[PDB]
Amino acid sequence: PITKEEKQKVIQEFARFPGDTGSTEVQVALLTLRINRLSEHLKVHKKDHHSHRGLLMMVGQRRRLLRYLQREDPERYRALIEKLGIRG
Amino acid sequence: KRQVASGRAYIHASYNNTIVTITDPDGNPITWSSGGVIGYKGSRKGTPYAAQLAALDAAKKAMAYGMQSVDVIVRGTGAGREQAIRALQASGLQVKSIVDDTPVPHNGCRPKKKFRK
Amino acid sequence: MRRYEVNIVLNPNLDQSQLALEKEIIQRALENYGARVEKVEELGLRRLAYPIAKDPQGYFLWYQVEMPEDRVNDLARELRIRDNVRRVMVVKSQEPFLANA
Amino acid sequence: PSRKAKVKATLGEFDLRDYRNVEVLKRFLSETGKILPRRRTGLSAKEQRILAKTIKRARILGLLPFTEKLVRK
RNA sequence: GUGGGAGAGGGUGGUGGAAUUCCCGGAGUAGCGGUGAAAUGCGCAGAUACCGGGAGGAACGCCGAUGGCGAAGGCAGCCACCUGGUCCACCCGUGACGCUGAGGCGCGAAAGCGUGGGGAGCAAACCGGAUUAGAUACCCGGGUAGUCCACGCCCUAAACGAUGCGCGCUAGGUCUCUGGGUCUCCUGGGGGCCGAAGCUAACGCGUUAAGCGCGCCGCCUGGGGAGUACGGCCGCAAGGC
Numbered sequence: 369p370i371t372k373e374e375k376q377k378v379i380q381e382f383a384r385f386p387g388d389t390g391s392t393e394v395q396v397a398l399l400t401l402r403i404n405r406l407s408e409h410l411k412v413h414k415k416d417h418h419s420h421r422g423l424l425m426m427v428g429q430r431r432r433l434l435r436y437l438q439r440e441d442p443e444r445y446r447a448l449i450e451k452l453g454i455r456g
Numbered sequence: 457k458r459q460v461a462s463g464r465a466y467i468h469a470s471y472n473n474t475i476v477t478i479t480d481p482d483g484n485p486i487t488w489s490s491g492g493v494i495g496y497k498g499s500r501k502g503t504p505y506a507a508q509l510a511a512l513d514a515a516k517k518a519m520a521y522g523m524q525s526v527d528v529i530v531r532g533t534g535a536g537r538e539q540a541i542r543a544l545q546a547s548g549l550q551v552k553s554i555v556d557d558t559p560v561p562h563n564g565c566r567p568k569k570k571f572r573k
Numbered sequence: 574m575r576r577y578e579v580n581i582v583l584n585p586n587l588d589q590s591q592l593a594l595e596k597e598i599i600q601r602a603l604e605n606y607g608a609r610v611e612k613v614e615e616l617g618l619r620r621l622a623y624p625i626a627k628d629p630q631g632y633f634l635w636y637q638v639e640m641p642e643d644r645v646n647d648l649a650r651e652l653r654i655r656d657n658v659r660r661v662m663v664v665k666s667q668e669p670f671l672a673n674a
Numbered sequence: 675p676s677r678k679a680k681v682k683a684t685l686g687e688f689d690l691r692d693y694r695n696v697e698v699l700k701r702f703l704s705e706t707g708k709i710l711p712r713r714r715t716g717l718s719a720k721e722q723r724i725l726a727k728t729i730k731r732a733r734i735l736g737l738l739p740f741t742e743k744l745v746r747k
Numbered sequence: 748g749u750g751g752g753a754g755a756g757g758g759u760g761g762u763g764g765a766a767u768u769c770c771c772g773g774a775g776u777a778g779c780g781g782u783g784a785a786a787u788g789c790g791c792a793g794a795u796a797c798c799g800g801g802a803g804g805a806a807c808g809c810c811g812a813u814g815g816c817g818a819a820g821g822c823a824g825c826c827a828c829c830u831g832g833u834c835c836a837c838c839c840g841u842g843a844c845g846c847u848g849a850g851g852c853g854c855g856a857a858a859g860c861g862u863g864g865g866g867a868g869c870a871a872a873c874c875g876g877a878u879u880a881g882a883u884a885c886c887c888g889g890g891u892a893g894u895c896c897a898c899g900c901c902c903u904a905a906a907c908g909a910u911g912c913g914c915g916c917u918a919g920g921u922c923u924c925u926g927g928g929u930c931u932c933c934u935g936g937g938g939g940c941c942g943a944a945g946c947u948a949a950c951g952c953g954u955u956a957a958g959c960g961c962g963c964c965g966c967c968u969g970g971g972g973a974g975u976a977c978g979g980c981c982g983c984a985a986g987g988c
């Protein structure tokens with residue numbers, strides 16, 4: 369699954385300032401983690417459609433968050449994309 | 457020709473018949489009777505009366521092997537399972553016990569349309 | 574890593590050398606799959622509700638253990654190979670749940 | 675009917691997850707191997723639901739019967 | 748975000764017992780089976796009933812509910828791994844990041860199709876026995892596809908709550924599943940029943956609205972002709988839109 373240490377690791381890694389949990393950068397980091405993990409699972413288990421729905425939703429949420437970021441702060445957005453390796 | 461004297465009475469009661477098989481304590485048949493073994497032929501084999509006769513018959517035949525006591529095992533629901541048991545009870549055989557062994561599935565095998573619903 | 578309970582039911586007909594031999598392969602394969610043993614209850618042979626491989630009784634071992642999760646199924650697979658090994662059940666440990674407490 | 679007693683009322687405290695306690699578990703099975711309903715076990719939903727699984731484990735282990743012959747009759 | 752919880756939610760690999768069928772063996776003999784009554788059928792190459800051993804396939808009794816989960820179709824032995832959703836508490840972080848959603852994409856019961864397996868039980872078609880005025884049926888005996896698996900198609904339905912999704916507002920009572928709290932009580936989430944106001948042609952609905960409101964989507968416009976014809980698109984086909 370995802371252990372508290374892996375999670376906290378990426379939370380600190382992407383947090384805007386100390387104590388930052390729910391900022392856009394962090395949320396997108398977390399979501400990217402879960403996506404990579406879940407699409408990894410669905411690499412095998414191509415027959416698990418129910419989980420694929422999950423994936424769809426997670427991607428949708430992520431894409432919304434990024435849309436908002438790129439609207440507000442094109443810098444923070446560019447940074448995020450590069451750092452995580454998304455969108456290209 | 458054995459001289460057994462203690463054994464098992466298996467009553468197999470269906471809606472079409474009753475078959476009373478009597479065996480030695482290891483389950484090997486000694487004698488058996490049924491609805492059709494007495495004169496009854498058609499539907500009449502499924503009668504409680506036919507069951508009484510089949511019981512009494514198997515028990516006579518079995519006492520001729522010198523049997524005294526039996527353990528009764530009842531398989532199936534059907535008219536005259538109980539009549540069979542009772543005929544056995546005073547057949548002039550001591551019935552030491554009665555047990556309902558009726559096999560039922562943990563749901564493995566699809567029934568004929570007759571039995572589905 | 575996660576903590577499981579291992580149940581093994583063995584042949585009641587084992588003499589001392591046979592039984593302790595089996596336990597030896599148990600231990601060695603447990604280690605070989607990376608299972609550290611936290612606790613053990615050997616409850617000896619006991620009566621069964623039904624015959625297991627023609628036998629009216631069985632010999633029960635229990636192990637509380639910590640091991641890698643990716644290894645569990647494969648461990649139990651290996652455990653089962655032994656002929657004298659009749660039953661194997663590996664269970665994720667859980668905190669006891671009481672009624673009338 | 676079922677006014678005899680409730681199986682939980684007899685017992686003291688005990689671990690409903692404990693698949694090895696045979697004597698306690700046996701109390702929750704009928705004359706046949708069948709798991710008693712709650713109207714008998716006098717358990718709660720969650721409880722009963724746990725009981726069932728642990729009984730099933732005990733059955734696989736050979737400690738409890740899946741089924742049993744009915745005596746008397 | 749942190750910390751708790753319930754669950755037939757999903758995928759993979761394991762594995763357990765009951766039963767059916769079959770094969771072997773023992774013991775046993777004159778029938779079994781089946782129906783309204785029967786006959787076909789099975790049985791002296793020894794059936795049925797009984798015990799022991801084996802093989803395989805399929806489905807998981809009790810628990811089991813008026814229950815739970817899932818967007819829907821749907822999901823039920825037990826075990827492990829992998830994985831989706833969700834609820835409660837703390838009030839910690841971001842700061843309108845929201846709702847809906849043509850087209851697109853994906854999922855989609857059963858039956859059906861392709862390749863290759865599998866095939867115990869059941870069983871369209873089919874072969875028979877009855878019933879009947881007839882009986883291309885109901886009932887009885889057999890029985891192929893199929894039902895099972897893998898992979899790829901099909902895209903339908905009384906796919907139903909026949910009730911689009913989101914949010915706010917408008918008495919209570921009662922049962923239940925599942926959280927939390929100063930645990931008789933108070934406070935969330937879910938499933939039922941009776942009912943205030945109100946609505947409804949009526950039946951009924953009524954904080955799980957079919958009440959009062961706002962947003963966005965889909966649809967309707969007398970019955971037959973007809974889900975037909977034509978055209979297009981999809982499909983191996985059946986056929987679908």
Ligand SMILES: NC[C@@H]1O[C@H](O[C@H]2[C@@H](O)[C@H](O[C@@H]3[C@@H](O)[C@H](N)C[C@H](N)[C@H]3O[C@H]3O[C@H](CO)[C@@H](O)[C@H](O)[C@H]3N)O[C@@H]2CO)[C@H](N)[C@@H](O)[C@@H]1O
Nearest residue numbers: 562563564565566573755806807808821823856857894895
């Ligand atoms: N692949 C598994 C599935 O098997 C299905 O097969 C199942 C269906 O044909 C049928 O389901 C019926 C259902 O129609 C009806 N509404 C109620 C009935 N209790 C169900 O049956 C089921 O009930 C329970 C739970 O599984 C079990 O105890 C029972 O063994 C099972 N037959 O019983 C079968 C065995 O469960 C279908 N082929 C399909 O859904 C799918 O392929």
Ligand SMILES: NC[C@@H]1O[C@H](O[C@H]2[C@@H](O)[C@H](O[C@@H]3[C@@H](O)[C@H](N)C[C@H](N)[C@H]3O[C@H]3O[C@H](CO)[C@@H](O)[C@H](O)[C@H]3N)O[C@@H]2CO)[C@H](N)[C@@H](O)[C@@H]1O
Nearest residue numbers: 415564758759760761762803804805806807865895896897
């Ligand atoms: N047992 C593992 C299961 O396998 C399922 O799929 C597998 C099982 O259905 C089946 O495995 C074996 C089969 O190889 C072998 N030829 C026969 C055996 N009876 C099967 O097992 C299964 O078959 C069916 C399920 O359809 C059940 O009736 C039966 O109880 C069950 N043991 O064949 C499939 C491929 O191995 C699913 N992955 C999931 O339910 C689960 O992991």
Ligand SMILES: NC[C@@H]1O[C@H](O[C@H]2[C@@H](O)[C@H](O[C@@H]3[C@@H](O)[C@H](N)C[C@H](N)[C@H]3O[C@H]3O[C@H](CO)[C@@H](O)[C@H](O)[C@H]3N)O[C@@H]2CO)[C@H](N)[C@@H](O)[C@@H]1O
Nearest residue numbers: 369370402422665750751752753754756757830831832833
């Ligand atoms: N769902 C499968 C089964 O669920 C049970 O265990 C599952 C649930 O009890 C448990 O629920 C936990 C919850 O306790 C905890 N407070 C939060 C957690 N997110 C939940 O887990 C849930 O969400 C995550 C995604 O984060 C999913 O990966 C997971 O499948 C889902 N159950 O997560 C477990 C994993 O799914 C059964 N006891 C077990 O046999 C089996 O894992």
Ligand SMILES: NC[C@@H]1O[C@H](O[C@H]2[C@@H](O)[C@H](O[C@@H]3[C@@H](O)[C@H](N)C[C@H](N)[C@H]3O[C@H]3O[C@H](CO)[C@@H](O)[C@H](O)[C@H]3N)O[C@@H]2CO)[C@H](N)[C@@H](O)[C@@H]1O
Nearest residue numbers: 859860861862863864865866891892893895896897983984
């Ligand atoms: N594998 C061959 C044998 O198939 C048998 O069963 C197979 C055949 O009896 C059956 O025939 C199917 C038919 O059902 C279905 N309605 C249509 C399908 N095209 C047919 O298939 C047939 O025809 C085609 C070409 O015409 C061939 O390529 C194919 O090999 C042949 N089976 O399809 C089955 C497989 O799905 C035995 N059960 C199996 O044990 C055995 O192995």
Ligand SMILES: [Mg+2]
Nearest residue numbers: 369370371752
């Ligand atoms: Mg967890």
Ligand SMILES: [Mg+2]
Nearest residue numbers: 425426428429
């Ligand atoms: Mg959402």
Ligand SMILES: [Mg+2]
Nearest residue numbers: 438439440441
């Ligand atoms: Mg700006």
Ligand SMILES: [Mg+2]
Nearest residue numbers: 472498499501
């Ligand atoms: Mg008859």
Ligand SMILES: [Mg+2]
Nearest residue numbers: 646649826827
């Ligand atoms: Mg295992």
Ligand SMILES: [Mg+2]
Nearest residue numbers: 755756757822
């Ligand atoms: Mg599941």
Ligand SMILES: [Mg+2]
Nearest residue numbers: 765766767768
């Ligand atoms: Mg068998």
Ligand SMILES: [Mg+2]
Nearest residue numbers: 771772773793
């Ligand atoms: Mg034989």
Ligand SMILES: [Mg+2]
Nearest residue numbers: 788789790791
């Ligand atoms: Mg003949």
Ligand SMILES: [Mg+2]
Nearest residue numbers: 790792793794
């Ligand atoms: Mg022959």
Ligand SMILES: [Mg+2]
Nearest residue numbers: 482773798799
């Ligand atoms: Mg023998």
Ligand SMILES: [Mg+2]
Nearest residue numbers: 798799800801
């Ligand atoms: Mg046998």
